[PDB]
Design a protein around this ligand. Sequence first.
Ligand SMILES: CCCCCCCCCCCCCCCCCC(=O)OC[C@H](COP(=O)(O)OCCN)OC(=O)CCCCCCCCCCCCCCCCC
Ligand SMILES: CCCCCCCCCCCCCCCCCC(=O)OC[C@H](COP(=O)(O)OCCN)OC(=O)CCCCCCCCCCCCCCCCC
Ligand SMILES: CCCCCCCCCCCCCCCCCC(=O)OC[C@H](COP(=O)(O)OCCN)OC(=O)CCCCCCCCCCCCCCCCC
Ligand SMILES: CCCCCCCCCCCC(=O)OC[C@H](COP(=O)(O)OCC[N+](C)(C)C)OC(=O)CCCCCCCCCCC
Ligand SMILES: CCCCCCCCCCCCO[C@H]1O[C@H](CO)[C@@H](O[C@H]2O[C@@H](CO)[C@H](O)[C@H](O)[C@@H]2O)[C@H](O)[C@H]1O
Ligand SMILES: CCCCCCCCCCCCO[C@H]1O[C@H](CO)[C@@H](O[C@H]2O[C@@H](CO)[C@H](O)[C@H](O)[C@@H]2O)[C@H](O)[C@H]1O
Ligand SMILES: CCCCCCCCCCCCO[C@H]1O[C@H](CO)[C@@H](O[C@H]2O[C@@H](CO)[C@H](O)[C@H](O)[C@@H]2O)[C@H](O)[C@H]1O
Ligand SMILES: CCCCCCCCCCCCO[C@H]1O[C@H](CO)[C@@H](O[C@H]2O[C@@H](CO)[C@H](O)[C@H](O)[C@@H]2O)[C@H](O)[C@H]1O
Lengths: 179, 81, 67, 469, 486, 92, 89
Amino acid sequence: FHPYNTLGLATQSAMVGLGAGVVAAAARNSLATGPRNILTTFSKSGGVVTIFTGASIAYVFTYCSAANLRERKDGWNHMWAGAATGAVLGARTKLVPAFIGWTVLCGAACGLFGWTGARFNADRKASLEQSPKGFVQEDAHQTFWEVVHRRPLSLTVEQLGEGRGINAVPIATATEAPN
Amino acid sequence: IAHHVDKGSLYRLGPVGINRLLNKASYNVINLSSNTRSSLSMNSMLILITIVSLLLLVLVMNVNFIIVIPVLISILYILFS
Amino acid sequence: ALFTSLVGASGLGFATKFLSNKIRLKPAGYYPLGYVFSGVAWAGLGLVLHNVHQHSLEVLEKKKTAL
Amino acid sequence: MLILAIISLITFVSMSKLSDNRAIIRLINIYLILVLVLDSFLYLLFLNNQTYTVMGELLIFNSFTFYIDMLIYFIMIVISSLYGYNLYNNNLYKTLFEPKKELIILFLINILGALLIVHSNDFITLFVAIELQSYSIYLITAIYNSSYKASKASMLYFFMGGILSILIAYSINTYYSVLNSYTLHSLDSLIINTLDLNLILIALSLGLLFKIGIAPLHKWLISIYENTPILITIYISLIPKISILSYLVLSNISINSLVISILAILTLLVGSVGGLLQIKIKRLLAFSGLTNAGYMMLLLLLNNNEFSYLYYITQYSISHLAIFMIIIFSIYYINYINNQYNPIIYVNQLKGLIHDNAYLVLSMAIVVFSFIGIPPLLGFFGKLNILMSILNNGYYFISIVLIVASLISALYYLYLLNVSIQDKNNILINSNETVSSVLSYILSSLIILITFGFIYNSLIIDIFNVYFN
Amino acid sequence: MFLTSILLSSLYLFNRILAWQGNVKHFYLFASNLLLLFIVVLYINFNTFSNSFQFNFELFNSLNPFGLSNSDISNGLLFGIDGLSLTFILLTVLLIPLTLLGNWYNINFNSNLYYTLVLAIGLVILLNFWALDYISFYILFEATLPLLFILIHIYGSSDSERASFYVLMFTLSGSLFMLLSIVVISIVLNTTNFINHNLFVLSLDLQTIIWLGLFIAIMVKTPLFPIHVWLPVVHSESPLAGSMILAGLILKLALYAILRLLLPLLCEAQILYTPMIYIISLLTIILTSLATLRQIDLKVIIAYSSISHMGIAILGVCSNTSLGIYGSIVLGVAHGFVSPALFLIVGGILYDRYHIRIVNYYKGLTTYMPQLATYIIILSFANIGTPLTGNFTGEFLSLQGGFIRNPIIGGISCISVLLAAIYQLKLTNKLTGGISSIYMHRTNDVTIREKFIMNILIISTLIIGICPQIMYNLLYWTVNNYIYII
Amino acid sequence: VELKPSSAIQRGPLNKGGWDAPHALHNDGAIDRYAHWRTFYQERFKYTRATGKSTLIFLVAFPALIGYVAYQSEGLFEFAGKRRGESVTTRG
Amino acid sequence: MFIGTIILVLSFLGFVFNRRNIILAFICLETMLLGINLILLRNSVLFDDISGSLFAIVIIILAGVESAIGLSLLVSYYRLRGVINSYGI
Ligand SMILES: CCCCCCCCCCCCCCCCCC(=O)OC[C@H](COP(=O)(O)OCCN)OC(=O)CCCCCCCCCCCCCCCCC
Ligand SMILES: CCCCCCCCCCCCCCCCCC(=O)OC[C@H](COP(=O)(O)OCCN)OC(=O)CCCCCCCCCCCCCCCCC
Ligand SMILES: CCCCCCCCCCCCCCCCCC(=O)OC[C@H](COP(=O)(O)OCCN)OC(=O)CCCCCCCCCCCCCCCCC
Ligand SMILES: CCCCCCCCCCCC(=O)OC[C@H](COP(=O)(O)OCC[N+](C)(C)C)OC(=O)CCCCCCCCCCC
Ligand SMILES: CCCCCCCCCCCCO[C@H]1O[C@H](CO)[C@@H](O[C@H]2O[C@@H](CO)[C@H](O)[C@H](O)[C@@H]2O)[C@H](O)[C@H]1O
Ligand SMILES: CCCCCCCCCCCCO[C@H]1O[C@H](CO)[C@@H](O[C@H]2O[C@@H](CO)[C@H](O)[C@H](O)[C@@H]2O)[C@H](O)[C@H]1O
Ligand SMILES: CCCCCCCCCCCCO[C@H]1O[C@H](CO)[C@@H](O[C@H]2O[C@@H](CO)[C@H](O)[C@H](O)[C@@H]2O)[C@H](O)[C@H]1O
Ligand SMILES: CCCCCCCCCCCCO[C@H]1O[C@H](CO)[C@@H](O[C@H]2O[C@@H](CO)[C@H](O)[C@H](O)[C@@H]2O)[C@H](O)[C@H]1O
């Protein structure tokens, strides 16, 4: 893998969240009911700026940190980032069990989002349609979407491990009397 | 067990918590177009906000993806909390 | 088979007539000629589908023959 | 046949009284039936997916569009039957459901715009047809001018559709500014990967999609569907959706868009959650249509989506017509007429329908469990084919969102059934008035299709494999 | 002759019977016993020396949608029975008439709808055991939820609305993940059939994903901890026929689903995942039993009791041992006999006399209701796994297999033998013991009908406990078809 | 026209037609209230220092213990017919 | 390109942020169509192309019909209400 620059990405994160919070505050000011002016965009906004900035900083910082600590790029980093973002969103409600639930559940949700590829889109060169499918032809290495009538036994033993029934030689041939 | 796990947390991660979650989310979804005084200006503002927000989000994702994720999480929070 | 398809489509037609009579809060034998009319109508639809399907298979077989 | 019908009905309605409009609707309903019977052999033109360009290169004719046109004729037949045949021959039902003089003409012109949208190959035809649809459907929302709610909805719908049409025109003229063309046939592999063109194309897609309620622009159309008459809602909630989504499916415009994915997820979540606290029937059904529009948005990201879209749109049309017809039939047993225009508004007015009409509740149950996607019904096979396509094309998070939305929507679908199978005091014991024969048969036929159409899935696939592949 | 002539004869006879006597229960019971006899004839004509599928038939084919297919291109739904299918089919046809007769005299409003829904659920379950592809299996696995919703909502107890919504929503939640699994299978292999699906070896990283969905479904349907909370409510607040059908057959559909959908396919994912199955099963056993020890509703206690025995069955079926598979199947059958008898006692005998299920009201039934006390003691000691009942045989062999696979987990799971006794006998001792309750007046003892049902269900379990081997002629292939050992 | 339902609709009461049997149970009220409480406990449950203890025990710690044991004891033991001196373990 | 984008954007903002009139909404729609037509015709001149001018004259016709229909709908609203107020469409 290639390391992430935490502080730079998180500074970009904070500026983006700040701009988004300003836009949401302006939208709230214009959509609202009561008497309002150019003063109220930050007085009467329900912590929108702090929501956006905190979520952005927390998510990007935690993601890049976990990617640099774990030394990997996978969906567990999105699980941690969701845990942190949920902790921020749940510290607003000044209650412990709601904070814990927010953390755990948005961690699980963003971790699912990362497990599935960290994308609302598709890869479109890893999809089943664009990838080699069906039965594999002549002793070739079975790819992900390919099908096989009969698999290699060394592969089974490595993927699964010896023990609990699964052995490098069948039992009957391995116990056959040398006659 | 019977009261704190089987009739507690496993109903919270279950029929009770989902019910409360969806009550709050539904109420926030329908109390969004707040003012029935004028239906036209409000939805017009919604067109404007949608177009602006989409343009800035597409800018942000072209810059880098992972930065748009918490923005969308916060948008869902604003819409559904 | 054709006869099976026509019988089944006529059964669907009888079901429509029955459910109509019941939605109307009438007895199920209110006007028994409607069963005959529904039968022949739905059987005509089934015959049409049968012929379309048969022509489709004939096309995909003519392709093999010409291949 | 539609233009012949329009030019005939304009004269025949001008030279006729208001006592004759129901019979006029009956006549043109039989006309559409005869057309769909005698002229439907034209499917043989599209054998092996032969495609034709007509009126220069302004229209396109293939199996997809022929099917959508047959479907729109079937829908117009049902909607005209609801106006041409009295449910009950009482003074109440001659006060609630009366056709206005120009309504049938506007329906046929809107159908014309619908079909010229799906058959469009050049953006000038698309724009002319979009406007011919939208002007006519403004006037359809407004024809019941003795309703405050309907006039209000007319004007909101005018302005919002106008703005979204401005967006469509900006998209079209920007496409022309870039490529000097109004035709999407002008695009290929090379032009897509050589020019960055996604802003224009997604602007077009969203200008078309927000005209059918795609979030976050759903509240206005849901208010319009609530505030309009029931027999107008049944039309204006279905036919524009079919037209525009069919155009956007035939035109492969958003094959792997991130924005359309995001907005489709948002449509699913909103259409599932927002319908949970709705106490009114038409808003509930509007949010149902919203989430189904989301399911159909998902297959704008596929590039091989004909079977799934056609199955789902056919089954959704049948279910939509059936549920609105059941709500129309339930007015005889509700204990409180709310308006001259929306005689039934709230779901709890359906309380105890099983004790007055049990088989109407059987129909409701069938339709509700098709909406939920319960096998062996038709919505299950719809959802199955959609899932097949989106998982074959690599949308794995959207699939889980789809399951969660399917589950959350079941609650407000089951609200209706639950209150319908509840007990009620003051049940019905006798009634000498009987509901119509024709409308009863139409509803029963739709229910039987929902229930027993899975028998023919093999045959439908075998026909598709010859006419669409 | 004609097919249509014969079924039109049956249809006309049904219509005239309904016209003259305004009830359907006699005709449905006649059809019940007729179907049982036909299935016994099929067992007479069943070859035990072939592992193949027999009595095959295909429906909804392109060439004959309203008939059976003889085609060289097969695009419809496949059906056919193996010995495993036939075992549960025998159980189903044995139980259906008893579920109809258990509610013979206690349904006095819209009776015909009740009996239609009961027979329909039973026939859907039968056809589900007859299925031979993922899609027919699915459409018969999910088609019971509408019927169960309606039945429980209209004909259920106080809290019937909640139970109706639960039995639909929980099961739909699990079954939609099953649907994602099946969709992946169909798009990857382009075939869905239970005949040659062990010939298609998928990659491990995809097996491990398909297995997750199938196992989430199996977890919600079995049930297994932590998704077991719907079962007390549903089995409690349903009509008696619903509870009997559910506990006897719908819970066993999950066991059959493991053996038919998840082991033959997905062998390597299963052999990698089964320690997680053992975690979940041991939790499901011990915590559900202890939770039973603090319940105040009788039918709820029996409902919780089903879960622990299904967890033991899961230990057995996920053991990769022939004895474990046979034990799980015998557990399914014997529980399908015994648990509906307990449900009859607590939902059709006592509930029909007193219309209450709180334990605090019940005490000293032995004085005025002695036959019922004898039945309670017999069925309790059968449910907890006393020898010479099939419950013990199944428990013994399932725990044998679990010990062979994981000695530590399989050995710790043998406290089932104790906890079963605790939560069953703490109830039996109070019901049968003491002075008769001051909150209850005297009522009749068990009738000839109730006794008939309980005696059938006791004779069956005693037969299969005294000689379990009589079930081997339909299972000596199945006990080796789903074992992955090199 | 005053929009009212149809006068043709004759309505009567819902009569389920059961034979009202005598009172076989004398309900207590205290027991019924105890039963309602113990059946609908789920709607009143709250997360406290006592309940969270049982949650984080039975849903986090005990499964983790069982899982560690199960994944360490996966293919360790094979003692069919094993004899004196022969190791019953496959690994160390 | 510039005049049209400017007219379009300012008309859209004067439509969205109108807390005054309904006539301003009508005016902003018409000016939006005007702006689109001007961009369209400038591109028509630069490319030396007729499709742009054809689309423009079609927009003229369609906008006329739009105005007619919109001001019939307003007249129905006024038939029932008698006053078209600052708010409420
Ligand atoms: C200024 C400097 C700029 C610097 C450059 C970088 C800036 C980045 C800017 C990013 C865009 C920020 C836009 C913020 C959202 C718009 C503001 C808003 O409030 O939206 C909601 C809006 C009004 O809501 P409100 O009136 O406040 O009342 C709420 C009560 N429920 O009402 C609305 O309906 C409008 C909705 C607009 C939504 C746009 C589409 C969002 C897509 C949702 C993503 C969902 C995907 C997640 C899927 C997960 C599935 C579980
Ligand atoms: C790119 C990454 C994207 C991945 C997705 C990330 C997810 C981001 C989610 C954030 C969006 C905002 C949604 C937050 C939920 C809305 C309601 C809420 O604020 O939660 C609180 C609610 C409170 O219940 P209560 O405490 O009793 O009431 C007082 C509350 N002031 O809470 C409760 O009712 C109790 C909750 C108990 C826990 C229930 C857990 C159920 C889990 C299954 C969820 C399925 C339903 C999903 C609904 C979707 C809603 C958007
Ligand atoms: C109709 C009413 C009349 C008023 C009309 C107003 C004028 C119309 C403006 C344009 C048309 C509206 C478009 C609607 C928004 C949605 C656009 C869209 O979704 O297209 C995005 C598309 C990429 O998305 P996609 O193809 O789905 O994903 C694959 C990515 N390779 O394509 C792209 O990649 C977009 C390219 C990114 C650049 C976006 C430009 C934004 C720049 C703003 C910077 C402002 C400066 C900083 C902040 C200032 C605030 C103080
Ligand atoms: C067509 C009127 C639609 C109105 C709604 C009624 C549904 C009619 C379905 C016939 C479709 C067909 O047979 O065709 C199959 C089409 C393409 O074939 P085609 O080019 O259109 O030729 C048809 C030539 N006809 C017009 C002479 C027949 O494939 C599809 O994806 C159809 C998907 C629809 C699935 C819904 C099934 C409903 C159950 C049908 C029980 C009889
Ligand atoms: C609400 C209940 C939720 C529980 C249900 C959980 C099911 C979620 C689906 C889990 C399976 C997703 O499958 C996952 O597998 C492979 C690894 O095997 C991931 O691995 C792939 O990730 C993507 C993202 O970098 C790239 O293509 C990468 O090269 C790799 O090939 C995929 O990103 C994802 O598709
Ligand atoms: C709840 C169950 C249903 C969940 C819904 C989703 C089901 C589908 C599962 C997601 C499939 C993910 O599959 C995706 O990742 C695998 C890796 O694991 C990749 O497979 C590829 O991995 C690469 C390594 O990166 C290797 O070269 C390998 O030989 C293969 O080519 C593919 O890019 C794609 O097939
Ligand atoms: C809904 C109620 C639930 C009912 C569930 C019970 C269904 C029981 C059906 C079992 C009977 C199946 O028995 C099945 O035998 C053979 C398979 O070799 C089928 O196939 C037979 O077709 C005929 C064709 O003329 C010939 O004999 C052919 O050689 C073949 O033997 C039969 O068409 C079918 O009858
Ligand atoms: C009381 C309620 C709160 C308690 C709820 C407890 C739920 C459990 C949440 C803890 C999640 C931590 O889970 C942790 O597991 C994975 C592996 O399992 C770790 O990540 C590890 O994964 C493995 C794969 O298994 C990688 O290849 C790599 O070795 C890495 O070190 C992550 O650092 C972390 O995600």
